[PDB]
Amino acid sequence: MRRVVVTGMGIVSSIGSNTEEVTASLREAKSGISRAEEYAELGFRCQVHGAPDIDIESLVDRRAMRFHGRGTAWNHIAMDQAIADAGLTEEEVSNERTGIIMGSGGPSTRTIVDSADITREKGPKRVGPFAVPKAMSSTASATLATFFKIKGINYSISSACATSNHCIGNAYEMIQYGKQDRMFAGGCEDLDWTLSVLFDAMGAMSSKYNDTPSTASRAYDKNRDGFVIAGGAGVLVLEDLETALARGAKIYGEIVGYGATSDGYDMVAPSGEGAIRCMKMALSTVTSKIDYINPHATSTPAGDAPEIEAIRQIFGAGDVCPPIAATKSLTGHSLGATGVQEAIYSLLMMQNNFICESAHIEELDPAFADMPIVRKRIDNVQLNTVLSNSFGFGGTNATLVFQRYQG
Amino acid sequence: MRRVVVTGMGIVSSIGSNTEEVTASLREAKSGISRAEEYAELGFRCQVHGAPDIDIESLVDRRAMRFHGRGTAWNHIAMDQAIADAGLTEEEVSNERTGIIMGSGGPSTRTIVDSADITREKGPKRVGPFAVPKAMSSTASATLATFFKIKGINYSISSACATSNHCIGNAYEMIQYGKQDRMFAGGCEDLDWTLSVLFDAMGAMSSKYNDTPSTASRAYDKNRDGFVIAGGAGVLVLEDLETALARGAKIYGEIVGYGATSDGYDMVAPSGEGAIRCMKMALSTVTSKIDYINPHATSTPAGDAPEIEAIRQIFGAGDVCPPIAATKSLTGHSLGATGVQEAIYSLLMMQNNFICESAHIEELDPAFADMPIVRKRIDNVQLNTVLSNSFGFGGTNATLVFQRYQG
Ligand SMILES: C=C1C[C@@]23C=CC(=O)[C@@](C)(CCC(=O)Nc4c(O)ccc(C(=O)O)c4O)[C@@H]2C[C@@H]1CC3
Ligand SMILES: C=C1C[C@@]23C=CC(=O)[C@@](C)(CCC(=O)Nc4c(O)ccc(C(=O)O)c4O)[C@@H]2C[C@@H]1CC3
């Protein structure tokens, strides 16, 4: 099986509109979370969100936008960034050996709702002719494959909050097994009340911190009370090692493990044992110690702990365990986009020799007092191997491991 | 790479609620298409649909239904059928070597719309706590993985109308490459005005035959005027050959090829050349002649022809070309569910030694007069190898080839 490397990255995030802005936010623990006044207007309990700040119309032209939801438009931007970063020619983007696996947690729920509303108010014709590619679950792959003239693999993986981790893993497999030489992988999510309300109604999102929105997302804090929802996108360019070397690619890291498992337990809560099996599977092909763990940790009361226990079972406790820092405390939870964004955060930390603070821990939950959760940024650290988990409703688990390429 | 066989099938279709009913419909060319009065009430142009007739509440209990949309409930039924057909024990369903890749074209659009409506009418809390797993794009895998206690792979592929063909293909790859020994693969789609209107607004669905609904879907007819939308589900049980043999499995067929490509051309129309490359890729590993082609052919004016041209380029014309019969003329177009349902139709035709009529051709489009489109059921035919295409918006292509297992 061939080796697979990351040669370009692109990102639209609550903590920055490119990798430079994101790096600065991670380094300085600058929260991306703000008050969502619209949610207050609609009567939500949770009134906080992690919103990108980026001018779409300046970066994607009107004709491309014809078939984009906001999430996939952010994905388009991230794709442009990743192609530029990688330095690809048009020929390298558009060829039979180059594909795309790009997903989202949901489609454009706003398109679905607006279409239903206008059907009832003004008639079906007034839905307009461009709604299907926004409303279908493949929207992220469909739009980008068409606009970037992708000729190889073209589909989306959907796995709720694991989505873009699986997208990367399956793209990794496609290259390992020789079917493709280059893949664009990642995903996106719109940020919209029509999705967010589904989580508010289940009591899944933070509401105790509405008066201090910036600190509402606080994985591992004793008084965490739900995740904070976010939108955005991320893209990695993946290539087989020989293809990358031959064209003088920048190598951000090598993908060296991937796990994917299923809990078979509860629809909306994790079992823990599925995560253990997932991490073991990702680690089974890894031959160095892990220097940093980017957990799934979303700041829910019932979510953060089973993952820590799974980590304990694999890695042990205290100094022997790798440092753990939950980036969702800064970024919120971008659902479909979170796996790829966390891969990018981890690869940027590797590049810049620091591990970010696990932010907004005002009082550590004592159940985690034995674990090396990062309370202050760690500088001048040589990260060679990093692990990132993502999990999703329906008991779906994905883990990726990336390594500094040294030959 | 290991060999992979189909050992069980399940289906909920506009042309039957199990494989027996479906076989009878195919044999007798009994249309599943009816008037959709609701679409007339809402002011649609198209007023026809392909609706399942099955009593969900009698087949899936209330607690399972908590997290099901209608599409995934139909998928649950099909899963139960496939497990029964395969004769699997509980242990064979729930184990680390057994996974699920199950998808839909969209999530429950009805859940999304109802939730938005009730938020605005009665408040966010009244959305209730069970909406996320219905509204997320992974709904088909999430629900079934949780209820059937799946422990291995768990995710959805989404690729619009190619969805369940890719789901089968990727499951096939997982087994070929040794990662899993058994997979449940397929998909589903709800049938609901909140999805169907998106296609009516683009003028994609048949409207000239509203007064004769049963014949509205008519692939290859000169006067075809759009597809006819449908809902339902299908599931295949896939196993590595040694696993199947060792337990005395029924073998419906062997998966012997899979292609997946991308047009990189137009959002909502096919290029043709992508389909050629897709079929060549599926055929590259096939060492017998094709005895039957189940086309994607949806009865659109601009869709049916580029596929026929691609078939011409690969297979030639007239007697040398394999017989072609478009099952969508009977079934309509179940979007996410159509790939797996067409695999099941093809495997049932193989089992029963007939090729169904390509229905509702009252006047053959002269552009296809050189092609062996089946005008009357062919009996007493030995099908050993069959090919099925599915394509989707966003230029996404998937082809599968199945073969009678003879050692
Ligand atoms: C049945 C319950 C109990 C309840 C109690 C405490 C909780 O923490 C939540 C809110 C979320 C559990 C969880 O982390 N799921 C969970 C999960 O398995 C996988 C992923 C995520 C994610 O956010 O990415 C996730 O969130 C659950 C969900 C629902 C309502 C309250
Ligand atoms: C820009 C146009 C021209 C127009 C003219 C004639 C047509 O036939 C349709 C309606 C559909 C083309 C098509 O088959 N797409 C198409 C496709 O590429 C892939 C899959 C399917 C499918 O149904 O599964 C499909 O339907 C197109 C779509 C849109 C409006 C009218």
UniProtKB/TrEMBL annotation, chains A, B:
Keywords: Acyltransferase, Cytoplasm, Fatty acid biosynthesis, Fatty acid metabolism, Lipid biosynthesis, Lipid metabolism, Transferase. It is found in: Cytoplasm. Residues 1-404 form the Ketosynthase family 3 (KS3) domain. Its EC number is 2.3.1.41. Pathway: Lipid metabolism; fatty acid biosynthesis. GO terms for biological process: fatty acid biosynthetic process. It comes from the Bacteria. It holds the Pfam family ketoacyl-synt. One of its GO terms (molecular function) is 3-oxoacyl-[acyl-carrier-protein] synthase activity. One of its GO terms (cellular component) is cytosol. Belongs to the thiolase-like superfamily. Beta-ketoacyl-ACP synthases family. Homodimer. This is 3-oxoacyl-[acyl-carrier-protein] synthase 1. It comes from Brucella abortus (strain 2308). The lineage of its organism: Bacteria, Pseudomonadati, Pseudomonadota, Alphaproteobacteria, Hyphomicrobiales. The gene is fabB.
